[PDB]
Amino acid sequence: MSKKVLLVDDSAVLRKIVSFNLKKEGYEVIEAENGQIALEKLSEFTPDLIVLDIMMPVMDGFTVLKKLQEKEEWKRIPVIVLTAKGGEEDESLALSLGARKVMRKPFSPSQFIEEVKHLLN
Amino acid sequence: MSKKVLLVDDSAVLRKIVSFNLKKEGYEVIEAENGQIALEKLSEFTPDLIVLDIMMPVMDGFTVLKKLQEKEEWKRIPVIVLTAKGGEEDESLALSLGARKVMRKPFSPSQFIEEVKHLLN
Amino acid sequence: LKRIDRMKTEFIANISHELRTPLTAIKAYAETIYNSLGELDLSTLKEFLEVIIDQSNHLENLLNELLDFSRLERKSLQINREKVDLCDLVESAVNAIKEFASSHNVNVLFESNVPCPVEAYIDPTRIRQVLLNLLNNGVKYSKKDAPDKYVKVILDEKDGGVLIIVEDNGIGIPDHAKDRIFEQFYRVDSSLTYEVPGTGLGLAITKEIVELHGGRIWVESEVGKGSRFFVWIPKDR
Amino acid sequence: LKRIDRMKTEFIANISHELRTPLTAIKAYAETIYNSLGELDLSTLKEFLEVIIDQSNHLENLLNELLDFSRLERKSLQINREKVDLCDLVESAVNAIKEFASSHNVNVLFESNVPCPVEAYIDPTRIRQVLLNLLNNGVKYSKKDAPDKYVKVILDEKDGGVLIIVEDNGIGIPDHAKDRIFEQFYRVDSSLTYEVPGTGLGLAITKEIVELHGGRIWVESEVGKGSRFFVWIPKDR
Ligand SMILES: Nc1ncnc2c1ncn2[C@@H]1O[C@H](COP(=O)(O)OP(=O)(O)O)[C@@H](O)[C@H]1O
Ligand SMILES: Nc1ncnc2c1ncn2[C@@H]1O[C@H](COP(=O)(O)OP(=O)(O)O)[C@@H](O)[C@H]1O
Ligand SMILES: [Mg+2]
Ligand SMILES: [Mg+2]
């Protein structure tokens, strides 16, 4: 059975191009417009991977990060953070909240997919 | 019996895309890397239309424009100036030197071709 | 005494934020097309090309603000008046934003409390930019989720001139800032303005264009209800 | 007083010029592709896409300069050192400039008077950036018409540190300017610097990176012959 990826970002333009590249590999994609919706969908299924933006209305990515490593079922879901927040302490804080890899925008889709494949091994 | 256009700009990236859209319409295209190289080619032939950049090494478009208003057989050749010079004075100066139309870049390739067709019919 | 250098430094940072977002799309879509030719149907190809084209046009608007900013500092911004029907011109603006407006489900309307044509001796390009600027904020500062979101341009003849109103059911403008929003670089740094692109120059350019026409611009708005931007220009001859 | 304001206003204009040229390419190529899929062979299609991709990476360079500029005014630029083979890293930088190099009829060289590998405790990202800026200037300021143009990296150890030299066949740098090219925004506005993309931030960013490593940078140049930039860094542990 194919791996499922939860794709969380406020930008429709961004999710469209990330979803397309994920499906090129044969993954299944579930989309979330903000951090609140992302958690609401995690009560229904468990993805093999989460792609997470930081700056979104309602609930930002830093809060999502902290909440996932507070629920025993979600601690082990690997998260890639993909964000335009190229801050120096932005990355460190994401890594200390449980993120496996922090990738900046603009990004290379191929590099992004190499990193996605790496955490799915 | 296809019309010829002399394409004068220092940028190869630009000459390539403009040359491609000109040949879609069936025009022949002669390229010039600067204004001096341009005029050296009007000694060998006479074009139906000139597309001219302003900022170039060796010889800029303003001096090309006036030398065309000078010579008798160059006088009546249409010149579209396509330039990154966005100033109102830059256009007025170029117009007063015989250019029939000044288009700024970034430019719309189809708006550009519509004005090219308009000056050749 | 010069906070200018402070506001100009965050202006650089705001240029970078406005540059970053479209560039993310352009790079990612362009490299995807290049590496996915066998995995794109024709419709997805064109729509990915449209994203590139639409994101480039955002960049071009960014570029034209920096150019216009240069014309503001150099006091060289200049209008060129023509005999122009304002009913037509305002429809050229609502149509040119009808698409971007629908991307947020905001309907653009035009009501003229007078008979057309509305003839006035104005700069048709620059007035269009004024309308587009204020229509653009009407969509960009729309209420996030909202029933029937609109932006309306209301033509009128008042006090010996033409009164252009642009009303919206948006998030509104707080009273303490109702004056400084026309200052260069000024943006209401609220919470519902987190990931909203902006340089803080649109209204400063709008105000300068309108005054060069001999007119004035001002705003009414309450927080939560909406905003009405008033543009008044003499008719001229 | 603080002429910094006037220098930042010219900074805005330079940003707008550096944004204009790639955007012209991106807009024209993307809309041509969109309107010409029936007239593009596969080879021309991929070529046009590569222009978009390459032009969007020019804009990414501009983006990163504005962010680094923000990290200078804030005095926030930091480095993260790690055990790094410096031979593999300069070789990494000549591959990232070789395409953009031959775009201007220029080859890139890398001699090394010291056996590889050369282990140094440096920030590999920022040193690579320093190398790329110096290499970028080498080809961005190569002699106009003349042939055999080159930029050369010479890696060596001297004075208890590592000495990197970046030498080129450039237009040269006048002596009245050799002592200010490293300052922010400053640029030689000579004749042969017409349509040359330029922020004037590069060498300032380079200098701060080098000094954060505890090193210094300096230049020797003669107009006509070319330029040599020296970067000296302690080896550390
Ligand atoms: N229709 C509107 N509704 C609410 N706020 C607005 C509206 N138009 C402008 N503003 C406020 O005015 C400020 C400056 O606007 P503007 O000069 O257009 O700059 P920009 O749109 O580039 O941020 C913004 O912070 C914005 O919040
Ligand atoms: N290799 C070189 N040859 C000639 N001139 C150079 C070289 N490197 C830098 N310069 C000059 O130093 C100035 C400052 O360089 P830099 O800070 O890199 O500005 P920019 O970002 O515009 O390249 C530039 O105007 C350029 O004229
Ligand atoms: Mg976001
Ligand atoms: Mg040119």
Residue numbers in the entry:
A (entry chain B), B (entry chain D): 1 to 121
C (entry chain A), D (entry chain C): 244 to 480
What's written in the study?
The bifunctional histidine kinases of bacterial two-component systems possess both phosphoryl transfer activity (kinase) and phosphoryl removal activity (phosphatase) toward their cognate response regulators. Here we report a molecular mechanism that gates the phosphatase activity of the bifunctional histidine kinase HK853, a member of the HisKA family, from Thermotoga maritima.
The two antiparallel helices of the N-terminal DHp domains pack into a central four-helix bundle, with the C-terminal CA domains and the RR468 monomers docking onto and surrounding the central four-helix bundle. The AMPPNP is captured in the hydrolyzed form of ADP, as previously observed. However, a close examination of the conserved and catalytically important histidine residue involved in the pH-dependent change of NMR signals reveals distinct conformations. −-modified D53 of the response regulator RR468; such a configuration would prevent H260 from engaging in the phosphatase activity of HK853 and hence represents a catalytically inactive state. Accompanying the sidechain movement of H260, the inter-domain arrangement of the inactive complex also changed. The N-terminal half of the first helix, which contains H260, was less bent compared to that of the catalytically active structure solved at a higher pH, with the location of the N-terminus of the helix shifting about 2.1 Å. Interestingly, although the catalytically inactive conformation reported here has not been previously captured in wild-type enzymes, it has been observed in a “rewired” HK853cp*-RR468* complex, in which the interface residues of HK853 and RR468 from Thermotoga maritima were mutated to match those of the two-component system in Escherichia coli, PhoR and PhoB, respectively.
